[PDB]
Amino acid sequence: VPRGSHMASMEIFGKTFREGRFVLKEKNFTVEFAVEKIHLGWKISGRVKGSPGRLEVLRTKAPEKVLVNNWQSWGPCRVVDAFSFKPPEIDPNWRYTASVVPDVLERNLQSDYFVAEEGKVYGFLSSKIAHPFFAVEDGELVAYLEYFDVEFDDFVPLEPLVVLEDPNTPLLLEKYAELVGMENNARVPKHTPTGWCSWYHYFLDLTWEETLKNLKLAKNFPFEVFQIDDAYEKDIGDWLVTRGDFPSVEEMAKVIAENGFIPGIWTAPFSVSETSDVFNEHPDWVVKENGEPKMAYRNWNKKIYALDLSKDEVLNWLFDLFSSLRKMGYRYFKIDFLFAGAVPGERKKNITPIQAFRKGIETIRKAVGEDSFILGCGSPLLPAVGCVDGMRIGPDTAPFWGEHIEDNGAPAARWALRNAITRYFMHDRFWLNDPDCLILREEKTDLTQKEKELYSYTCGVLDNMIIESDDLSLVRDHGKKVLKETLELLGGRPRVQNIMSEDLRYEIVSSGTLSGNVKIVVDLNSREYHLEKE
Ligand SMILES: OCC1=C[C@H](O)[C@H](F)[C@@H](O)[C@H]1O
Numbered sequence: 365v366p367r368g369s370h371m372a373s374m375e376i377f378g379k380t381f382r383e384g385r386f387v388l389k390e391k392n393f394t395v396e397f398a399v400e401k402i403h404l405g406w407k408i409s410g411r412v413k414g415s416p417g418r419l420e421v422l423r424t425k426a427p428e429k430v431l432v433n434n435w436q437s438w439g440p441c442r443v444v445d446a447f448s449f450k451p452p453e454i455d456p457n458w459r460y461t462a463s464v465v466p467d468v469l470e471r472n473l474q475s476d477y478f479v480a481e482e483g484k485v486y487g488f489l490s491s492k493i494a495h496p497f498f499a500v501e502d503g504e505l506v507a508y509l510e511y512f513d514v515e516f517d518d519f520v521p522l523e524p525l526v527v528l529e530d531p532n533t534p535l536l537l538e539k540y541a542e543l544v545g546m547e548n549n550a551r552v553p554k555h556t557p558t559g560w561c562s563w564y565h566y567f568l569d570l571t572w573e574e575t576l577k578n579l580k581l582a583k584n585f586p587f588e589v590f591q592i593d594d595a596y597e598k599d600i601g602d603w604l605v606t607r608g609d610f611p612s613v614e615e616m617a618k619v620i621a622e623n624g625f626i627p628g629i630w631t632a633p634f635s636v637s638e639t640s641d642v643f644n645e646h647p648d649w650v651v652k653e654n655g656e657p658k659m660a661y662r663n664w665n666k667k668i669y670a671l672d673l674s675k676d677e678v679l680n681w682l683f684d685l686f687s688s689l690r691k692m693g694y695r696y697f698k699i700d701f702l703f704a705g706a707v708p709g710e711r712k713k714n715i716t717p718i719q720a721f722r723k724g725i726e727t728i729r730k731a732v733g734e735d736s737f738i739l740g741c742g743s744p745l746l747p748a749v750g751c752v753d754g755m756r757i758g759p760d761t762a763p764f765w766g767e768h769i770e771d772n773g774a775p776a777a778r779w780a781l782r783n784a785i786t787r788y789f790m791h792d793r794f795w796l797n798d799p800d801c802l803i804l805r806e807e808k809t810d811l812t813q814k815e816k817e818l819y820s821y822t823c824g825v826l827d828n829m830i831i832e833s834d835d836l837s838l839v840r841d842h843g844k845k846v847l848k849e850t851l852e853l854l855g856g857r858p859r860v861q862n863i864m865s866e867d868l869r870y871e872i873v874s875s876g877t878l879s880g881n882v883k884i885v886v887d888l889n890s891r892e893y894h895l896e897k898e
């Protein structure tokens with residue numbers, strides 16, 4: 365266990381750090397907590413009742429360089445200089461992707477769930493009730509549990525906090541993630557699906573006619589799943605109403621299955637647009653502000669509202685939707701924009717947005733059953749552990765590297781891959797990491813052969829999910845060889861050896877792959893790699 369001058373300098377719930385069992389009785393809340401030794405660190409656990417509000421758990425001097433983590437799929441996991449931080453301007457159309465507590469992020473450096481420095485990890489093991497986050501406030505790192513003004517008549521469990529120390533920072537992050545996995549009964553599938561996804565070629569312009577073209581060609585590729593992305597639906601929330609040349613959602617599943625694939629489908633199940641049938645029928649089903657529908661985000665050139673997952677009517681609707689899809693034969697569900705279900709606001713029941721979120725995703729899991737694969741996307745990470753099988757862990761990739769794209773969550777292969785690297789340790793611990801789709805076509809793309817190889821082989825070494833997204837008629841010998849060689853790199857235990865890198869060069873080893881022990885060194889600025897196989 366770490367002992368030292370820096371440990372004496374910490375405070376836990378406002379008290380000087382030391383081992384033991386404690387009670388803090390304040391005006392508005394009571395905390396009972398223990399500070400206990402664990403392998404390579406300390407664990408702070410306990411229970412809280414009353415109105416804890418934004419509850420300070422830990423305080424310590426901020427490190428100079430910190431690995432910070434955004435709460436959801438698309439947001440950055442990256443090393444930042446804690447002392448030269450300036451607040452970002454928050455996009456009013458996407459504020460809750462930046463932070464569930466935007467008041468923090470507009471003033472102070474924020475990290476959600478965990479934060480790391482060289483030789484040290486601070487990390488919460490769960491987000492079941494509170495949102496756990498860190499802020500750097502006038503040179504101090506402060507760990508908080510946000511309860512969003514909810515009051516608890518009887519004790520509920522704290523989200524446990526671990527403080528881990530060891531010179532091997534990657535080992536610490538892996539250990540943290542194993543503790544999260546155990547705390548939340550993580551689903552780690554024994555088999556990883558391969559497959560095809562429409563989005564990164566066709567986007568919203570997918571037709572059924574092009575879908576069928578790809579379905580036929582897909583029989584020549586090593587694809588298990590055939591997944592229809594955003595395009596088929598008439599509106600956001602109207603998931604069983606199709607548009608354009610698409611047949612019924614049931615019919616699509618039957619054609620896909622008849623052609624020998626596992627049918628997959630995209631939804632944004634916690635989202636309903638201002639124009640949707642479901643919203644116009646059920647205006648009382650959404651999260652509110654001053655009693656009116658609260659915009660969760662703007663996309664598809666529409667205001668999008670969040671379903672209120674505290675309401676039984678809403679949970680019954682979700683259950684019926686996903687049960688219906690399962691009955692049709694879908695067994696792979698990409699469930700997206702899930703942050704919407706955890707937006708702060710007024711709900712029917714006085715529960716946190718995190719409690720609400722977890723009721724929603726648990727309902728989905730019950731509806732699709734145990735033999736359905738759930739891929740989360742645009743999702744709060746820690747609250748989803750135990751429910752999803754796979755999780756998108758980066759911003760969207762793209763059929764271009766993204767030379768002129770900032771690290772701001774806009775699609776770009778370079779930033780998608782950076783997050784697959786810096787969140788590598790969640791893989792096979794929280795869930796299967798989804799690094800986003802391989803784009804292996806050699807027309808209708810600005811990616812080079814070398815860029816396609818660098819992305820693909822990195823994902824292989826990391827043992828991540830391998831989904832291709834292309835017009836398959838434009839994938840020829842190079843693309844077919846890259847996919848084949850990628851799948852030969854799967855099956856190992858990866859480690860990013862230099863996780864605190866600030867120059868976008870990473871050394872990645874993977875032990876026990878289908879190709880033996882491998883190593884790839886990548887440079888995301890020069891777009892070069894060096895791959896070794898044993
Ligand atoms: O709207 C479709 C869509 C939205 C998000 O950006 C996802 F991350 C992306 O993969 C696509 O599914």
Ligand SMILES: [Mg+2]
Pocket residue numbers: 792827855856
């Ligand atoms: Mg594995």
